[PDB]
Amino acid sequence: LVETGAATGVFVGDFQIPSFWCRVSDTTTTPYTYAGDEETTTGLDIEVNYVDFRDASGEIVEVGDSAGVRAN
Amino acid sequence: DFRETGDSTGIFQIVIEIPESLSNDKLERGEEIILEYTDWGPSGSDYVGDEDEDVNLTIYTSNFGATVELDQ
């Protein structure tokens, strides 16, 4: 994440969606235990989650957005 | 967790996703969903922890005709 300007307060970050990704078998252990086979990301929904330490009232509120990886 | 709507409101809200599977088994269509919580402080309680009245809510899952058709 990089800020747009010196005092803009808006952070912009980007990446390219891969064709193949490795699914995490379980998130209950560290380091994560990954599945043994990869799967194509098409059709799956890509969701982000920005952890907000201080909401408008000044506390932790979990906000994110949703999108889908289209295929033709 | 439960989060209060406003500093002087008293109403708590939270966004919950309906699970497709609770623990090693799926959740079925038309299943009876009961959301019960214990107040520990009901109107008939002289103080906290005196009366253990419980309150529940009924939630329905979506039911629609799973019709199957063929071209010919």
Residue A71 CA to residue A1 CA, distance in Å, equals 27
Question: If you measure CA to CA, which chain B residue comes closest to A59?
Answer: B3
Burial of B40 (0-12, 13-18, 19+ CB in 10 A): middle
Give the method used: cryo-EM
Question: If you measure CA to CA, which chain A residue comes closest to B5?
Answer: A57
Q: Are A19 and A40 in contact (CB under 8 A)?
A: yes
Closest CA to A48 of A29, A22, A69, A25: A69
Q: Identify the residue whose tokens are 């038309």.
A: B30
Q: Are A21 and A34 in contact (CB under 8 A)?
A: no
Residue type, A56: A
Name the DSSP letter for residue B18.
Answer: P
Alpha carbon B24 to chain centroid, angstroms: 20
CB contact under 8 A, A61 and B7: no
Q: Which residues sit opposite A47 in a β-bridge?
A: A66
Q: What is the resolution of this structure in A?
A: 3.4
| Preferred mutation among A52, A54, A57, A61 to probe B, highest tally of B CBs within 10 A | A57
Interface of A with B (CB under 8 A): 57, 59, 61
Contacts 24+ apart (CB under 8 A), B28-37: B28/B61, B29/B61, B29/B62, B29/B63, B30/B60, B30/B61, B30/B63, B31/B61, B32/B58, B32/B60, B33/B58, B33/B59, B33/B60, B33/B61, B34/B58, B34/B59, B35/B59
For CA atoms B12, B15, B21, B23, the dihedral sign is negative
